[PDB]
Design an enzyme around this catalytic site. Structure first.
Site, PDB file in Angstrom:
ATOM      1  N   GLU A  50       0.804  -1.248   0.000  1.00  8.85           N
ATOM      2  CA  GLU A  50       0.000   0.000   0.000  1.00  8.85           C
ATOM      3  C   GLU A  50       0.838   1.300   0.000  1.00  8.85           C
ATOM      4  O   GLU A  50       0.462   2.307  -0.621  1.00  8.85           O
ATOM      5  CB  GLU A  50      -0.909   0.057   1.249  1.00  8.85           C
ATOM      6  CG  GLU A  50      -1.689   1.366   1.380  1.00  8.85           C
ATOM      7  CD  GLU A  50      -1.494   2.104   2.710  1.00  8.85           C
ATOM      8  OE1 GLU A  50      -0.403   2.058   3.347  1.00  8.85           O
ATOM      9  OE2 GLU A  50      -2.456   2.798   3.106  1.00  8.85           O
ATOM     10  N   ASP A  69      -7.721   2.093   8.465  1.00  8.16           N
ATOM     11  CA  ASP A  69      -6.345   2.551   8.546  1.00  8.16           C
ATOM     12  C   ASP A  69      -6.128   3.587   9.653  1.00  8.16           C
ATOM     13  O   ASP A  69      -7.057   4.233  10.108  1.00  8.16           O
ATOM     14  CB  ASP A  69      -5.797   2.989   7.177  1.00  8.16           C
ATOM     15  CG  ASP A  69      -4.418   2.336   6.871  1.00  8.16           C
ATOM     16  OD1 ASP A  69      -3.368   2.731   7.441  1.00  8.16           O
ATOM     17  OD2 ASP A  69      -4.391   1.367   6.072  1.00  8.16           O
TER      18      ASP A  69
END
Length: 326
Positions: free
Chosen positions: A156, A211
């Site tokens: 990511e 997140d």
């Protein structure tokens, strides 16, 4: 247009039982988390060990687990990536998809643990699976067309400078593979009647991305109109939990208020982006503002605030139980 699945509210008694966090729960989540509290640099040995741990943990609970490996070019040269995709009931048409990334940022100044980003969100997903397992295996037996799927994206983080080519290695790859993999309702168990399924990506009913979690006083907003009907369930659940006196706060008679019942936009580019371009509804559980520690070398265990984590686990357990009607 309405949400495609009827939105039925969690039973009060489940609400209470999800709002519990015993000594064993704290122990379990923390022991899960300790495995993540190491630097997870793409391609590293510890990174590999972390991946193996996720995989063993889900297979040990009879999930279907896939290791989706590939090579990609980066500003730092060629890198191997492995997404992990775990699915409770493969043959179920629709997936509630929960997701995070298990790779850590390559920091210039030293070892970066990445405790909020996203060690904790990875622990949270495994913890949910382990604690709700008995119910999840019961839900599966229904064969009513809905299952739960966890994705742990790799790569990511940008290696050099965030850009369309330097970031989201794992998501870009998986979004694409799954879009290209054709299927249809008749190949799948118990699709909803209105459904128009042309590929795997159509089978992602909603993607909830976690997140930067584990710091004090997060503040979330709904970042997508399409998913406001789902976001609202988070607000409502936090509220019922406070009413029931099951949030952990510093003094009595306080209330948490993480999920603001309002919205904004940001467009904090992330693992949701490639799925969003192919029409996958998205809820991004990310705070605004980002924590203190974001991308500093102090994104570590000592800065994690255990009362907030506990509260969030409560909300997530309850949220999943309501969506899947456990």
């Amino acid at each position: 247009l309405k949400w495609p699945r009827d939105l039925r509210p969690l039973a009060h008694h489940d609400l209470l039982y999800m709002g519990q966090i015993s000594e064993e729960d704290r122990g379990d989540f923390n022991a899960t988390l300790r495995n993540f509290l190491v630097p997870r640099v793409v391609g590293s040995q510890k990174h590999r060990e972390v991946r193996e741990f996720i995989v063993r943990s889900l297979k040990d609970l009879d999930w279907d687990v896939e290791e989706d490996c590939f090579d990609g070019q980066t500003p730092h040269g060629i890198k191997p990536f492995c997404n992990v995709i775990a699915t409770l009931n493969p043959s179920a048409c629709h997936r509630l998809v929960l997701a995070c990334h298990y790779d850590s940022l390559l920091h210039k100044e030293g070892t970066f643990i990445g405790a909020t980003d996203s060690a904790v969100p990875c622990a949270q997903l495994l913890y949910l699976a382990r604690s709700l397992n008995g119910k999840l295996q019961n839900q599966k037996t229904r064969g009513d067309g809905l299952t739960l799927q966890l994705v742990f994206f790799d790569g990511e983080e940008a290696f050099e400078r965030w850009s369309s080519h330097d970031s989201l290695y794992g998501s870009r790859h998986l979004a694409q593979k799954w879009h290209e993999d054709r299927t249809s309702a008749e190949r799948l168990e118990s699709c909803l009647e209105r459904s128009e399924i042309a590929n795997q990506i159509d089978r992602m009913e909603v993607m909830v991305l976690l997140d930067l979690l584990g710091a004090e006083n997060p503040r979330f907003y709904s970042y997508f109109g399409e998913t406001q009907p789902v976001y609202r369930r988070l607000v409502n659940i936090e509220s019922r939990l406070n009413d029931a006196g099951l949030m952990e706060l510093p003094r009595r008679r306080r209330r948490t208020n993480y999920f603001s019942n309002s919205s904004t936009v940001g467009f904090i580019e992330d693992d949701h982006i490639p799925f969003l371009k192919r029409s996958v509804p998205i809820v991004h559980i990310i705070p605004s503002p980002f924590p203190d520690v974001w991308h500093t070398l102090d994104d570590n265990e000592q800065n994690l605030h255990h009362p907030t984590i506990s509260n969030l686990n409560k909300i997530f357990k309850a949220f999943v139980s309501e969506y899947l009607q456990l």
